[PDB]
Amino acid sequence: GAMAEEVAEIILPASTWILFFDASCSINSPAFWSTNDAVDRIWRLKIAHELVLLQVVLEGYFKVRCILRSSAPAFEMVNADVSELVSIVLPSGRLVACTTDEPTLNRHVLTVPPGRYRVLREWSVHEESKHYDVESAEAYPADEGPDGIITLWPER
């Protein structure tokens, strides 16, 4: 039960929002960001479960582990300070990430079967606050993090 099926980690800088979405989502195109009120249209995508939003308190470099799991995790993230159950729709199954600092990041996270997933966002503010002074992804200490874990399992 609760079997890890696919696992990957990304390390990226961010000052406010890390955004997870299907590669086919409108946010993954320049036309989304070239027109006004992109911040309102991000929130509408979140409301519509087309993106998942990872907020950070201050600018830093953060390690995010993403897991496709057969069900909800048997063990919570050990140092998590917050846990929220949301969902995401992935019409192509290609899960990618960007930030409001780098909208063109298009960072591949995982390729999962297309469909709708329950999503657990686990985040450690304590771990996040260790990494505001990280200069680069390469300088992120290998034995530290993840600052958060994003777990997907099929919405049934």
UniProtKB/TrEMBL annotation:
Q: Which domain of life is it from?
A: Bacteria
Source species, please? Chondromyces crocatus
Name this polypeptide is given: Uncharacterized protein
